[PDB]
Amino acid sequence: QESLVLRGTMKAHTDWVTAIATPIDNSDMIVTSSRDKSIIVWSLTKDGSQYGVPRRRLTGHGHFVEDVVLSSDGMFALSGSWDGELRLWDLQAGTTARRFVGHTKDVLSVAFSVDNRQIVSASRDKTIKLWNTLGECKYTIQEQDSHSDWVSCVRFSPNNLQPTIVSGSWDRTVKIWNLTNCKLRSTLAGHSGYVNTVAVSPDGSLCASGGKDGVILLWDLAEGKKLYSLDAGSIIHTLCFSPNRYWLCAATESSIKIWDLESKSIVVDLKVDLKQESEMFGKTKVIYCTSLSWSADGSTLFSGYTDGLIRVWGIGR
Amino acid sequence: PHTDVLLFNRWSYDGVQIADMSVEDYITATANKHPTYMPHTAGRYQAKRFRKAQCPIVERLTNSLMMHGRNNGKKLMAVRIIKHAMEIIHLLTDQNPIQVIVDAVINSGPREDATRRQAVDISPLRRVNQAIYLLTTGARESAFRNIKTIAECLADELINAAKGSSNSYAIKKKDEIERVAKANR
Amino acid sequence: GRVRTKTVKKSSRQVIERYYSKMTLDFHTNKKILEEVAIIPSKRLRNKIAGFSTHLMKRIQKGPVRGISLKLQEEERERRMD
Amino acid sequence: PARSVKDVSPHDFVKAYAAHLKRSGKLELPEWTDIVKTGKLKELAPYDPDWYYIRAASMARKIYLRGGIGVGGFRRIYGGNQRNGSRPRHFCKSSGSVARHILQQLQTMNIIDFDPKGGRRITSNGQRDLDQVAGRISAA
Amino acid sequence: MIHKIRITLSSKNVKNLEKVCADLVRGAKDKRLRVKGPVRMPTKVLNITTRKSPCGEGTNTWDRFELRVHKRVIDLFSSPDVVKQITSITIEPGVEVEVTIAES
Amino acid sequence: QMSKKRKFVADGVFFAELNEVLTRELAEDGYSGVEVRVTPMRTEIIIRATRTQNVLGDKGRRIRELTSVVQKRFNFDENTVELYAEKVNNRGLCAIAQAESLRYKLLGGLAVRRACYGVLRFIMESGAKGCEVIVSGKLRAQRAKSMKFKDGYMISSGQPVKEYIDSAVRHVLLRQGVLGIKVKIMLDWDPKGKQGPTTPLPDLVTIHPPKEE
Amino acid sequence: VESVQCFGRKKTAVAVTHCKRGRGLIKINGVPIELVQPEILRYKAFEPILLLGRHRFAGVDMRIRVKGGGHTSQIYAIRQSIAKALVAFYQKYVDEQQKKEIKDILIRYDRTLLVADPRRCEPKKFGGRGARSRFQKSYR
RNA sequence: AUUCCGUUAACGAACGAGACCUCAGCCUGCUAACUAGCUAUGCGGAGGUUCCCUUCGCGGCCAGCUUCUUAGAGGGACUAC
Numbered sequence A: 001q002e003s004l005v006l007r008g009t010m011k012a013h014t015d016w017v018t019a020i021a022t023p024i025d026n027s028d029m030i031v032t033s034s035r036d037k038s039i040i041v042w043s044l045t046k047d048g049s050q051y052g053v054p055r056r057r058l059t060g061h062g063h064f065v066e067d068v069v070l071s072s073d074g075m076f077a078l079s080g081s082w083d084g085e086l087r088l089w090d091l092q093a094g095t096t097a098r099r100f101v102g103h104t105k106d107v108l109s110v111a112f113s114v115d116n117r118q119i120v121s122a123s124r125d126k127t128i129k130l131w132n133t134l135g136e137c138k139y140t141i142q143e144q145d146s147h148s149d150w151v152s153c154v155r156f157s158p159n160n161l162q163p164t165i166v167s168g169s170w171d172r173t174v175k176i177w178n179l180t181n182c183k184l185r186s187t188l189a190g191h192s193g194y195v196n197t198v199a200v201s202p203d204g205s206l207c208a209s210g211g212k213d214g215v216i217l218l219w220d221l222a223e224g225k226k227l228y229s230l231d232a233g234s235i236i237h238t239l240c241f242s243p244n245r246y247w248l249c250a251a252t253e254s255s256i257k258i259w260d261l262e263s264k265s266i267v268v269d270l271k272v273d274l275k276q277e278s279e280m281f282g283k284t285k286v287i288y289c290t291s292l293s294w295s296a297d298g299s300t301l302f303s304g305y306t307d308g309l310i311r312v313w314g315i316g317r
Numbered sequence B: 001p002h003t004d005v006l007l008f009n010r011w012s013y014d015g016v017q018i019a020d021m022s023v024e025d026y027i028t029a030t031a032n033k034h035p036t037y038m039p040h041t042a043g044r045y046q047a048k049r050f051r052k053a054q055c056p057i058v059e060r061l062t063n064s065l066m067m068h069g070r071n072n073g074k075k076l077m078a079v080r081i082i083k084h085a086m087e088i089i090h091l092l093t094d095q096n097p098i099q100v101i102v103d104a105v106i107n108s109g110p111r112e113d114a115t116r117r118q119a120v121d122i123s124p125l126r127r128v129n130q131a132i133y134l135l136t137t138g139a140r141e142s143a144f145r146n147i148k149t150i151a152e153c154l155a156d157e158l159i160n161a162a163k164g165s166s167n168s169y170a171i172k173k174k175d176e177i178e179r180v181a182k183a184n185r
Numbered sequence C: 001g002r003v004r005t006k007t008v009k010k011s012s013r014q015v016i017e018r019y020y021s022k023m024t025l026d027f028h029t030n031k032k033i034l035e036e037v038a039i040i041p042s043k044r045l046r047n048k049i050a051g052f053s054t055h056l057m058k059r060i061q062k063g064p065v066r067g068i069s070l071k072l073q074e075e076e077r078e079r080r081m082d
Numbered sequence D: 001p002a003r004s005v006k007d008v009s010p011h012d013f014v015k016a017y018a019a020h021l022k023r024s025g026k027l028e029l030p031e032w033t034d035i036v037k038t039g040k041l042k043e044l045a046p047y048d049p050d051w052y053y054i055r056a057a058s059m060a061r062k063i064y065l066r067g068g069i070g071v072g073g074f075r076r077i078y079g080g081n082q083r084n085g086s087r088p089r090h091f092c093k094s095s096g097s098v099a100r101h102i103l104q105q106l107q108t109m110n111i112i113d114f115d116p117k118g119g120r121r122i123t124s125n126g127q128r129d130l131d132q133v134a135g136r137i138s139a140a
Numbered sequence E: 001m002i003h004k005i006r007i008t009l010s011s012k013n014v015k016n017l018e019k020v021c022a023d024l025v026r027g028a029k030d031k032r033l034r035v036k037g038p039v040r041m042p043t044k045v046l047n048i049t050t051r052k053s054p055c056g057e058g059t060n061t062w063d064r065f066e067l068r069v070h071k072r073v074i075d076l077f078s079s080p081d082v083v084k085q086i087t088s089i090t091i092e093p094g095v096e097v098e099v100t101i102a103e104s
Numbered sequence F: 001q002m003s004k005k006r007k008f009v010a011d012g013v014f015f016a017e018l019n020e021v022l023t024r025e026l027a028e029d030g031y032s033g034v035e036v037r038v039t040p041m042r043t044e045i046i047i048r049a050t051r052t053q054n055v056l057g058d059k060g061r062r063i064r065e066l067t068s069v070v071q072k073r074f075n076f077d078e079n080t081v082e083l084y085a086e087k088v089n090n091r092g093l094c095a096i097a098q099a100e101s102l103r104y105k106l107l108g109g110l111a112v113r114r115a116c117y118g119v120l121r122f123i124m125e126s127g128a129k130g131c132e133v134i135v136s137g138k139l140r141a142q143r144a145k146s147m148k149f150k151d152g153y154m155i156s157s158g159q160p161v162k163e164y165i166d167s168a169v170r171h172v173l174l175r176q177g178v179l180g181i182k183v184k185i186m187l188d189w190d191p192k193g194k195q196g197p198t199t200p201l202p203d204l205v206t207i208h209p210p211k212e213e
Numbered sequence G: 001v002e003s004v005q006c007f008g009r010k011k012t013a014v015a016v017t018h019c020k021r022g023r024g025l026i027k028i029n030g031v032p033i034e035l036v037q038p039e040i041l042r043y044k045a046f047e048p049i050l051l052l053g054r055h056r057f058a059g060v061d062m063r064i065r066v067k068g069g070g071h072t073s074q075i076y077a078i079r080q081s082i083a084k085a086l087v088a089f090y091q092k093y094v095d096e097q098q099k100k101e102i103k104d105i106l107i108r109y110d111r112t113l114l115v116a117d118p119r120r121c122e123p124k125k126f127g128g129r130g131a132r133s134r135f136q137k138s139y140r
Numbered sequence H: 001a002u003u004c005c006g007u008u009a010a011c012g013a014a015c016g017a018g019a020c021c022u023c024a025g026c027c028u029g030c031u032a033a034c035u036a037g038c039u040a041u042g043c044g045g046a047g048g049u050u051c052c053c054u055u056c057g058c059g060g061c062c063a064g065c066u067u068c069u070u071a072g073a074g075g076g077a078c079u080a081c
């Protein structure tokens, strides 16, 4: 029942922190995106005045950067933007290596495959497209049974034997696709309002959907059944399962709430307190978390806020 | 405080002080308030009220030298004239020419006026505006149809005004303005 | 001045009447919603409608407004009194 | 460092190279040097007794910097405002005979030659001559 | 065998001009021909300014009349016969097509 | 060979002069406009008229005379220019046709008040958003005055006037002087682009009705 | 090839600075920047160097091309292109924190060092000789 | 701003205003240029110390590229905070 405390803050961005991506190698680098239309590569110096400093700033995009994901190697980053384009970033060279064109409206979510051999993106044009990272092929997932509104999140299932894509949408449905044939498998309908985030458990046996209604519905990916429901009480912006501690974190406008899944009780509620940050490590009344990401080892949690500040929460007392 | 910026790379802003409470916040000639290497900035100072109080006092003097019509917009000549005048001021007074310029502005600004006619007080900003206008009007008048150059006339006008001597054109006009104001109290 | 005309105010109220669930408190998200749920001929007109509707969403959060009829909100009030 | 034409002040260079052309004794000044003006836009003849060498040095420096300039181009380069009494000023060209004569002299000195596309072009000897003079100017 | 053929398009209507340019580039990409363009020349703005009044009475008001000419240049690397096939398609009204063998 | 600037101006002057020649030759045949479609090997001139049977003549005699005189006058190679008559699909939405329709009613003798309301009523029946007929001149008295007949929607200012307003001006040479006819028809938004402009009015905002699924 | 190309603008003047890894050369159209003309505006062009210091430019070579505008506006365009080129170079090839430091210095002194001035000439309207100025009005 | 909020024996509309259209201001993002250029490279000239450095000229539809130029499509401001 360990709680989390504020390790430090990182202050490079000057707008909403839309997404955060941590390395799979548990390195001292994280990559964040923001509405300032830039992506920042960080150097995590735990000791010092600031928990981390911006190493690089990549600014190729023409509009807001909505999502960012790192490859398994950790030397490349993939980002989506409201200009309707995906960019693969050579982090070492700080340049753009590949441009994926085809989405006719804002891209709201991107994800790498487990092998990093395929890329999937979501867009406001109501479509999901599959790409080849090094090839030129593209396969849009358009069918009679497809999302009828904005696709706000797409995630790959961490199961190699049965590849699966889970896509939320503003039509209040959470579809589950089978990548083998690119055909719909199941449709989940239990949300009163739009869904703006989905998550898949590290084992791949669970899902977590949230959005307008402020209700987290945990589904069973294999059978597409609603196991139970958690109540955040506020609009949910992102969900992430803890890598090691079998928790589920939700970024709500009120606060960041972590539920112990086995007990279904809130482990801790993390609320921004500028008074503490002013004296601990030292604009807008309404500041809330917009992005979450766990460290590879699960020791620290990174939160991106609407004020452009990244707060690091570490397990402890 | 200390700054590495030197006007014309010749004159130091260190030690320049504005010893007058009323007009201290409307004269930009100190090291802490945006020192400038040259009195030529393509600034946008008329966008808002009280915004030209941030313009450096040396550049405000330079602008008022672009008169009359024959001299409109010839700011390179105006910057040269003030550059030469400050060199002359240093020779005659053995003082920091920036300090002499602020003293001339402080002494030549009228502090009371008549309007409608009854006596009214003058705001610190208009007091600085009047001082600049009076100093450059006197230098321009003494240079016209005279062997003496405009830079020498400007230097003498500033040296006398900074000293408070009545020989200055701007000091006499300030006394005349404040003499009529007292008559209409 | 920056007074919104009847075109902007009238359209904003209609949007909030029948899409209150979709609308948010963010201008940038709201103007992407107006593209989906309305035909606004010009970009400048779309920005003003999105900005004023975002202003009206903040108004509704604190309490009720005059010209906007939100049925679900009305039903909540009726239950309270009864 | 090793200074060339571009590395020295144009005012200093023209003075040094003009004194170099006069000192060589290769330019043959025409009969009308002392009589003429440098264009109808002028009121008086040039004040400098060595104005011809100064003009020739200036024209050599411009051919060095840009090839293809003809006589008409030099008339514009040394033209300017003509005053018309009670009427407004307008641009006027300078003398073509002065430009043409100077170009024909620098060409016999082998400082310039005919550009194939038209106009005059600096030669290899011309480049050396101008560059050597610029190198001897004292740093100032 | 392969020659650089230049196609020049002129029009007062931008949308019609851009529509024909796309139809030619896309019509040549189908044949896998090398295409250079379209290159957009600076717009020519013919301008006639004239007195509004048919007489000389009143405030002297002026009408500024403008007739804009837009010009596009497309270079196709292929034989004249193939180019004649692509350009033979019906062209939108007011768009003037001009095919010439580039002198290179 | 002439430069692009002069060629485009020369093409505009040919269109303006051709329209004037047809406006007078085909005045009493409902002439409503012309389209000049210059193509390789042939320039096609399409004549729009409400009454095409009078523009073609008996067995196409008149349309051949117009083609012949046009080819000679404008230095066209023989058998390199064609004239084609065409009918106006909706005669009541063309201001040029209604202005000429009103013109011949006034010449015939029909009263101004009655003639102007016949045009005003016909235009609104044809599916127009509005109409306005103005007649000016010596109506009955020696002194001139203006009569304005308006009905429906109308706009005056801004860019939309160019797309939504169809206006025409004609002169009626009566026995006591000249009357001035002005017909101004406001069109209706036609997404297909046939009856009216396809682009909507700038201030018209349409909210899609929500779906319940 | 660690090079950047940043521009600066003032009215119709455009200066592009090509900043590459080097030894500290700074030249405008082939001429050392110490010979910038006019000489009294030379201070404005040197402000980025004076503010940051020559040691910041010791590892770069800046070659500047400038076109359009006039004598004063070209200096401001050059002045702006140098500051932008150095900032773009430090961000891309040195470090983010060093870019943060120098950009703060440039901004604290003058925001036009990095942000262009949007002012342009207002068009003339009939009924007068200027944009605003009207023809003199007489009644009798 | 007869612009709006409200008041209210008026209610609901029509014009003008606004919207709108053109030009200008931002885009190191998109499209792509031998009638626009840049960078690099090769060769050549000149200067300085054979490499190297500075500078200029010429060439390459197979150097590369689009920052600068051009002009299409879009984005951007809404008083958003």
Ligand SMILES: *[C@@H]1O[C@H](CO)[C@@H](O)[C@H](O)[C@H]1O
Pocket: F032, F033, F048, F088, F089, F093, F094, F095, F096, F097, F166
């Ligand atoms: C007369 O009718 C034609 C039909 O094409 C129309 O284009 C004109 O505007 C109208 O006057």
Ligand SMILES: [K+]
Pocket: D076, D077, D078, D079, D080
């Ligand atoms: K000259």
Ligand SMILES: [K+]
Pocket: none
């Ligand atoms: K060489």
Ligand SMILES: [Mg+2]
Pocket: F155, F157
């Ligand atoms: Mg209107």
Ligand SMILES: [Mg+2]
Pocket: F157, F158
């Ligand atoms: Mg208007």
Ligand SMILES: [Mg+2]
Pocket: none
């Ligand atoms: Mg560009």
Ligand SMILES: [Mg+2]
Pocket: none
């Ligand atoms: Mg635009």
